[PDB]
Design a protein around this ligand. Structure first.
Ligand SMILES: [Cl-]
Lengths: 124, 124
């Protein structure tokens, strides 16, 4: 109803984990959805966000996210396989910037986000 | 381990619901958390996003978010009571803009987000 539980990553498949580049798919399920029956904005954002943290790990660093921005282009629907592709855009000393695109099986872009992260330090 | 389920709104309390202004609280629990034991940035954003949709309902409309921006200021921690306050800063015929702030019980800001919405229709 007006407030309800939402879940993210009840399922996933990690397709490729590469330097500054991470691809993961997932399928939209009942608890992915908002009250109008479409994939929830928060759900979509969290897909992007997790992938961006993995991009960040893939360049060697701990880095925390200071700000993000997302555009919602098309609806996610129940049963869609969504492809989440994170790419490092700036791999810096002090900051990182990661772009993420969400895509459906037609390869239409569902959402695009950018995450601006502060480099705390190396990963070991 | 690296990809994992997250849940949002496993508990909540609807504090107030007024024209252009909605307050909800929630308590940070185990499935709110990221690998480091703090509230996940996607869980945080999803709290803001749902509240902004209620703000849009509160001004009498269905709306869909085109774009959001969020700034993370302070970590949420396990057990925290978070207060999510959404306010309509633009209540337009064709667009709505909603600011949401998340604070802890000290009134320290945990995050602030802004949501840019397209009006799809009048409620009922
Ligand atoms: Cl529920």
């Amino acid at each position: 109803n007006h407030l309800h539980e939402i879940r993210v990553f009840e399922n996933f498949d990690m397709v490729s984990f590469e330097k500054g580049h991470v691809i993961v798919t997932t399928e939209v399920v009942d608890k992915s959805l908002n009250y109008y029956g479409f994939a929830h904005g928060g759900y979509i954002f969290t897909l992007c966000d997790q992938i961006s943290g993995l991009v960040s790990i893939s360049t060697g660093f701990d880095a925390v996210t200071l700000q993000s921005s997302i555009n919602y282009l098309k609806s996610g629907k129940l049963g869609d396989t969504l492809l989440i592709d994170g790419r490092c855009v700036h791999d810096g000393r002090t900051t990182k910037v990661v772009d993420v695109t969400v895509t459906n099986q037609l390869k239409q872009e569902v959402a695009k986000a950018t995450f601006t992260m502060f480099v705390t330090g190396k990963r070991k």
